Design a binder for this molecule. Structure first.
Ligand code: 3KI
Ligand code: 3KI
Ligand code: 3KI
Ligand code: 3KI
Lengths: 396, 395, 396, 396
């Protein structure tokens, strides 16, 4: 058990809205700020960090190796190596899985793992500029669609594919809007109660006329109602059910945490928040966007030797309200135990950071509630799912 | 021995030149072709593949998750998960290290790992197109520079930084050109002897006029001489030493291999080529581009409990001739044991595939020569190094 | 006197600000709207229009032959030919000079002449996209700079060259700012008195949420003060004097008028506004941006057999406050007779339309004041000037 | 005879192929070279040049006022004014008409008129780059299509519209290919006989390894046969008749000449080549691309008091073989008098220069053959036509 792998000091920036407060702040700078703050608050000797692993999906234009920028600009010694992982919308949780594997295999003793993303900062791409278009009009591609949200096999948006999940599982528009309004209401009430203050580190943004201290999530809509959501038009198919109100936005943020054995965390005076009891990574047909969390959660629960009913809360990414409903109802999870404090429809989905954001949220929620067992899971894009089974570590 | 981690069936495409035969073939398609060929030749049951891990540096414009495209278009079942790693010029070796860690930690039993890159296919980037340039001229950035070759902290080319390595270690232009000419001569003789045929899988490219069967490396320059290299102008600093002739090109290629325990490989009827005996990952100041292999090799050798003199061959990426000379000389390696069959100055440096290409090269060279111990190492970009200590597995 | 060449029915749109009300309305559409309104108000038989000539500088992206689009989309019969002229910032006056030449040479009897511009609608240019950039970063050029405001020989902005005019004529910063503040004051007072209502035709702009009727100039800055202008930084040279406050903006608009002999105008029931008594086109060194009006005015006055002191008002384009001061003081024009109702620093400089706008302003101002003699003149860019000497025609 | 308007010293570059020898040489540099050579060969006193007028269609990216660049870099004194005209594919002939109107109206006494174009050098346009694309892919437009070859009302290529002319006049594919093969054969034989050497001025192109002297037209295909043309696929409509072999290419070149009264040319020691006896400019429905030369020719002939049978040769631009056939057969012109030495299918169509190239060709051909009367005409784009009726002037 001393060899159990634990997460300590999980922290996140607030999440920016599209064209919002973080629109001019690169993803790697958001990560560097979290890492700098984590080092400050823990007092961890920076030389005890063996590697930095960061998730980031839209690497275009972010410069050589985002994770190395996070590490060096986060103030770690230049001797700390770093690399960037991409499992699309699961990347921030993949970074933690990568850290687990490096610790259990003996390659590292302590890793800073997390993820970063800023969708406004994703550039446009000009595939014909290197060797020429020659004659005739040519296209400039939005990288957030080409590398992040469109399926690589069909070139259709993930939301377009999710309409086929909607049809297969008969998920009504009204159920999606009810779930979305509930996510907004749960999130706003938790935010108002101060429940996210412990996990959020403020970022100071410098502008022309001055400075903004960005300290609280800004992308949520607390006035959302089922009635207002029913006014909206479908976003991905003319006859569809998915709208801008029952899907997350295009967001920016970062989160990071310390991954180590429990023995190492105790030795260094850290306070572990969660032990990783199981990991699942699964894949399905790419067109079946949204279902991957079901087999991945089953794998993670098998490794943990837990059943669904043993779990106090599930935190499953709300890539679309439809995905949350399908996963919840396929696994038979109680609605009061699913995305308890709201999810990405409210707070935003900064794709390569969201898995780390969900781990951070669970670390702090279990501390507050004294719940013992949680599962974090995300659909990937391209037909994959990732899940972690997590248990609270008591305060020593 | 059961749980030693081994590499089996390492294979690679030939390496394309800049603006060359592979210029219209995406990196993910190159990887898919190697993986399809690997599955066909080994007869490995596709359901035994637990994950595909691919290195790729210039992910811009390649579509969602290059590794998943490699896996699915390589013909693996959609149930095989996949993810893409980026440790810059070490990414293809990082994929193998990631596979090692997944197997030793129990997350996987068998992984297909490798790397892919196509520098011609890297797009240009327009940072001001989303929200507008408003007024005044604006820049379109070459992604291969912004995301691959320029340092992220200084925005200078890696070759500009390597001039400071050259100055610190007093690496003469004459020695850089001697090393580059030797790499071309060694590679040309090995290619003519057929020494790369076993590791290469041909790729058929469909063009306007018909089909080209691309079957052998095309980027080397057998016309290279030291006298010719001495005439070239410096590429990165006015009074510099690094030129287009003592640096590799901007290349395309892919390589992949099976990583598993030795017991799993024997059970499934594979023929292991190499056992991973040590892994080193190190970092230094970003400005000291090129030195990273020295500490990384020392880490890998310490894990293997080998000394430099025990190693039959070192395969260290020739990111510039100057880097090869510094690493060789600082570790005291004999020149006949350093990049024995030539290196990237001759064959090319498709950045995210090169580490997997070098592992492939060593797997086949140790089989041919019966040498026992090798080290593969690459500098990263950004001040890092990766190294693996590798031992031949008998037939 | 029957064969004298006259201007009738001069009209203009209001002038839009940069990123303002006309930002989505192409220059050719602005011209079409003026031409359609001119035809409706005059009742001119459309078959009597022999040609349409329009000035336009930033032709990039406007589609084949802007003048033909203005004519056809303005409702003229397809049998009316049309062509587009470019003498940079003098293009809208050049269109009238071209019309004069076609009528006096017998090629035409009646021409609709004017100019159009919309600086927001100027695209960016990618010179390397056709045949490729190959390797290394490449530039996307702002067409308004490449084709409109930068000198073609030096690639420096016209405002950079004007700093040498400032140094040659010892034009103080304080005098430039006084001239700019006075232009704003004169314009704001004339606008409030209703003096621009007769020349302006409103344009209705359709948007997502509805419609805007754009009916009055929007680019002026009536709360400009000399003290506020003194705080601004130089725009073109570190140690310069020209700023954003003593130069016009980047504007959009159109203007058009009928040009014919006097006999033809009377025959067709038009009411001539001005007779063209002299035309001057001159050129000087490109680096001497701003001086061209001086020799051009002298040529136009020589043709008209007038002296400077015979002229009731000069309307000289305020490309920069410094140009207005140099031209006024070199010719010895009384300040109360120079840009009497304000100029482009206040109302805007939609480059290819401005010459037609100034002719329109003078036609209406002389009608209102009963002044007899005026001169319109503009510097061009590239070291040229254009001028017309104009006399009021009494009502029939 | 005194005040008749004459053309002297007409000269042209050779015409470059698309992606050919002139691909790196701006249009304005081609014109400056012709003007410099014209001044050197005639010995004309540069102070006697009153204006430079140049046609140019694809002005995007060519810098401020192409005609002023031609004049200044051609070595004329900076005191010579200049402006650029755009009547699409008739621009180079429009520059001569503009010069005629300025001389007859008394604005000028001697003008250098011509046209320039380089289609390789036309840039791509990015309409969304100024104010952003926000989200989603966006288009980069080829300026040669947007501003030169596509109709401004339909956005279809001029060749697509010409398929309707083909259908209206029942112009068979076999006839189009016969006309195109004959144009190639006539051009190749005339070129081999040396008949274009007198009008061409060589251009020296500086390249990597050294210098190329470009001295002869390169875009023609002397091996063209009717049987080879029959194999080609239609270029503009799937069921079409127009192919890359019965249409011109995308070419580069320049041409210029001196325009003055006959008395002025004699006074200055020039040798007039042609007198302008009639000018016609006509317009028709835009969709009837290609028919415009018919009414324009009729107007020019009426001005000259000539009929078709009085004309020794017609030089009508081969915008497509179909256009040449329709114009020839509607006017009843003898086939051996229509495009006698070949036309643009063979030599190329550098759009803004072609009208000036055709005038140059006729000036030299009439001198060689002692023919007396010729007509030059071009379709415009957008449903217009321009024509000039021209008579040889004897040597003094
Ligand atoms: C791994 C994968 C995934 C995914 C996803 C998703 C979310 C899509 C929402 C996005 O399309 C949203 O509707 C955009 C609204 C932007 C509106 C604006 O321009 O402000
Ligand atoms: C991880 C890092 C790295 C690195 C490196 C490198 C190689 C650079 C060589 C490249 O600059 C080469 O000189 C380009 C020549 C291209 C010439 C052409 O346009 O054909
Ligand atoms: C023929 C020639 C000319 C000319 C001229 C001019 C005016 C230049 C003013 C322009 O540079 C102005 O300062 C631009 C301000 C725009 C600020 C914004 O982004 O809103
Ligand atoms: C004013 C008007 C007009 C016109 C016109 C025209 C000519 C079009 C020929 C062009 O479309 C040709 O097909 C282009 C071939 C280029 C092929 C290549 O890429 O090399």
């Amino acid at each position: 058990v001393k060899d159990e792998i634990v997460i300590s000091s999980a922290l996140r920036t607030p999440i920016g809205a599209f064209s919002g407060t973080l629109k001019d702040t690169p993803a790697a700078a958001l990560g560097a700020h979290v890492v700098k703050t984590l080092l400050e608050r823990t007092g961890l000797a920076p030389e005890r960090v063996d590697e930095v692993v960061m998730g980031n999906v839209l690497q275009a234009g972010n410069g050589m190796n985002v994770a190395r920028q996070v590490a060096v600009n986060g103030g770690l010694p230049v001797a700390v190596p770093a690399h960037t992982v991409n499992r699309v919308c699961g990347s921030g949780a993949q970074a933690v899985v990568t850290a687990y594997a490096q610790i259990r295999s003996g390659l590292s003793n302590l890793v800073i793992a997390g993820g970063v993303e800023n969708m406004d900062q994703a550039p446009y791409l000009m595939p014909s500029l290197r060797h020429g278009a020659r004659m005739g009009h040519t296209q400039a591609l939005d990288a957030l669609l080409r590398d992040g949200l469109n399926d690589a096999f069909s070139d259709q948006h993930s939301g377009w594919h999710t309409e086929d999940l909607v049809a297969k599982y008969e998920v009504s528009r009204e159920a999606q809007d009810r779930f979305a309004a509930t996510s907004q209401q749960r999130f706003a009430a938790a935010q108002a109660a101060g429940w996210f203050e412990g996990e959020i580190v403020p970022v100071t943004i410098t502008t022309r006329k001055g400075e903004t201290v960005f300290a609280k999530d800004e992308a949520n809509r607390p006035d959302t109602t089922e009635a207002g959501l029913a006014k909206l038009r479908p976003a991905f198919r003319k006859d569809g059910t998915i709208t801008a109100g029952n899907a997350p936005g295009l967001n920016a943020g970062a989160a990071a945490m310390i991954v180590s054995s429990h023995a190492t965390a105790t030795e260094l005076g850290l306070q572990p928040q969660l032990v990783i009891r199981g990991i699942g990574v699964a894949a399905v047909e790419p067109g079946l966007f949204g279902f991957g969390p079901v087999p991945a959660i089953k794998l993670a629960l098998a490794q943990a030797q837990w059943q669904v009913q043993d779990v106090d809360r599930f935190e499953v990414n709300e890539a679309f309200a439809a995905v949350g409903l399908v996963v919840r109802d396929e696994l038979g999870i109680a609605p009061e135990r699913f995305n308890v404090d709201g999810g990405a429809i409210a707070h935003g989905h900064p794709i390569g950071a969201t898995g780390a954001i969900l781990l951070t949220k669970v670390a702090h929620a279990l501390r507050r509630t004294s719940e013992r067992r949680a599962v974090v899971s995300l659909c990937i894009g391209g037909g994959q799912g990732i899940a972690l089974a997590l248990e609270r570590v008591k305060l020593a």
